[PDB]
A paper describes a structure:
Unexpectedly, we were able to solve the structure of SYT1C2A with one cadmium ion (Cd2+) at site II using different crystallization conditions. This structure mimics that with one Ca2+ at the high-affinity binding site. Indeed, the analysis of oxygen, Ca2+, and Cd2+ complexes found in the Cambridge Structural Database of chemical structures determined at high resolution reveals that the coordination numbers and geometries of Ca2+ and Cd2+ with oxygens are very similar. Interestingly, the comparative analysis of the structures of SYT1C2A in complex with Ca2+ and Cd2+ shows that Glu 334 at L3 changes its conformation to replace a water molecule at site II, whereas the positively charged side chain of Lys 275 replaces the Ca I. In this conformation, SYT1C2A might be unable to bind membranes through this site as Ca II would be occluded to interact with the phosphate moiety of phospholipids. Thus, these data might provide the structural basis for Ca2+-mediated activation of SYT1C2A to bind membranes. The metal binding site of SYT1C2A restricts the metal–metal distance to 3.7 Å. Hence, it is likely that the constraints imposed at SYT1C2Asite hinders the presence of two Cd atoms site hinders the presence of two Cd atoms.
Synaptotagmins (SYTs) are the plant orthologous of E-Syts and regulate the ER–PM communication in response to abiotic stress. In vivo studies showed that [name] is anchored to the ER through an N-terminal hydrophobic region and binds to the PM through the two C2 domains at the C-terminal end. Similar to other C2 domains, SYT1C2A folds as a four-stranded β sandwich with a Ca2+-binding site placed in a cavity formed by three loops connecting the two sheets (L1, L2, and L3). We have shown that the domain displays a dual activity to bind PS or PIPs in a Ca2+-dependent or independent manner, respectively.
Author numbering: 256 to 368, 378 to 395
The structure:
Amino acid sequence: RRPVGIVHVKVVRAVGLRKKDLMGGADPFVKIKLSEDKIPSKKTTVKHKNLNPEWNEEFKFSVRDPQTQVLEFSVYDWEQVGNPEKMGMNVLALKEMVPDEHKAFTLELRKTLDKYRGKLEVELLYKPFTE
Ligand SMILES: [Cl-]
Ligand code: NI
Ligand code: NI
């Protein structure tokens, strides 16, 4: 249960998101969760009225097993009233990480784990601990 290293997750952008709101397209933010972890999920900022949001927002997670653990990204639409509705999601195993390399991925958004839902572009940088 002791952390092997730290993975730096950059949420870069989404491209081609579906229209969801009656006007303005969507107000997207991303939730990021790491499997086999009790840390509450992280989220990006809300981008208002943008189907091609650009975030470049960075998050850090403690890694306890690079072989087993997977990240889950979920794109939600913000509204002031009501619960955010999920627009799409996908998963990304940490066994695709590379130590000390920025590695970029394009995840197609899907309904669950069909209509096209856009792409999410992210980066991972794995910094393992030494000695
Ligand atoms: Cl926000
Ligand atoms: Ni970094
Ligand atoms: Ni660098």
